[PDB]
Design a binder for these strands. Structure first.
Ligand SMILES: [Mg+2]
Ligand SMILES: [Mg+2]
Lengths: 163, 163
DNA sequence: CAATCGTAGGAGACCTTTGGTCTCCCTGCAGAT
DNA sequence: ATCTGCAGGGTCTGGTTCCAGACCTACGATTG
């Protein structure tokens, strides 16, 4: 009963749920790159692969990863980056033996009753902390919303339910 | 000794050069998927990882990969795709033990004197044929220009010269 | 450090060489033989 | 099948045969 959840973008995270009910969540590793004479943050491929290889989740574990679907009004750099982060994550997960299942944000948001929220990121952190109370301290900052999304993706895949 | 060259886009290829002078080139694996009610070609992650795992090139072999640099006039779908394809290949190569070195198309084109051609893809196929004459039969078609570019990237990395 | 705001954006190599100049794809989808 | 031409484009799910309604992200910058 292992489940993995991945928020693949630059502030994202990977969550790992164990059969005994324990959970781990890891911020996505990144590095600072020079592009067009400015600095950009980019996912750290080797650290991701090393992170996956050190997981105790066995081969065949399912990884639920949020589907890339940027808005037509997002810029072309946004489109490249969501595509790049998605491809790098999917290849790393497959190479590490995990079975990848893409999930639309509409799917897990509806599942946990989070659609049409005035504060979607805050509500995600609140839902994740309720499902994983031992992660409550790791979810108190606004910048922890990627941790929450990864946990909620894993909770969705595991079929967990809010009280 | 061993050198890998990767043209990462959907009609691209991976070339593998051996220390004895032999060469192999494989079209990039792809599948057809439904996106927004139409059919799209997307690289086949699992097939790419299995291909890489089957190479005799040892760990630490350098994989020269063409840097993604879409034009600001290309559509946002082109930007997403080139990012996705790039990320997928980089992670697959890293996970399979290879050292990844991104090369700009202007670098290997200038090295082989191909800059400012009015028929750049035809010229690439001609140059690859001369450098790898046993691949002449595999470079006869217009759609083989991806195979040509992968071979030229690998030949660049190995320091080959046209006669 | 952590949060907020507002728009949606190229990038690279090598020279002219501490800024300038010139170069380079790709995707998606319809058509034609 | 292979190639040519040419413009640069959302995509998804829950509900059916198209509709209705839903969803981000990146990149720079400034505020304490
Ligand atoms: Mg997300
Ligand atoms: Mg290319």
């Amino acid at each position: 009963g292992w489940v993995i959840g991945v928020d693949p973008d630059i502030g994202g995270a990977i969550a790992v749920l164990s059969p005994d009910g324990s959970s781990q969540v890891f911020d996505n590793p990144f590095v600072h790159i020079v592009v067009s004479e400015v600095i950009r943050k980019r996912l750290d491929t080797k650290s991701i692969i090393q992170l996956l290889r050190g997981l105790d989740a066995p081969p065949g574990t399912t990884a639920y990863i949020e589907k890339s679907s940027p808005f037509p009004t997002d810029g072309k750099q946004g489109w490249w980056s969501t595509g790049f982060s998605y491809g790098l994550w999917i290849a790393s997960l497959v190479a590490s033996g995990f079975s990848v299942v893409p999930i639309a944000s509409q799917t897990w948001k509806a599942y946990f009753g989070l659609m049409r929220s005035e504060t979607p990121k805050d509500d995600s952190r609140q839902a994740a902390s309720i499902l994983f109370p031992d992660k409550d301290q790791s979810l108190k900052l606004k910048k922890h919303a990627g941790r929450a999304e990864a946990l909620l993706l894993a909770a969705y895949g595991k079929g967990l339910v809010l009280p």
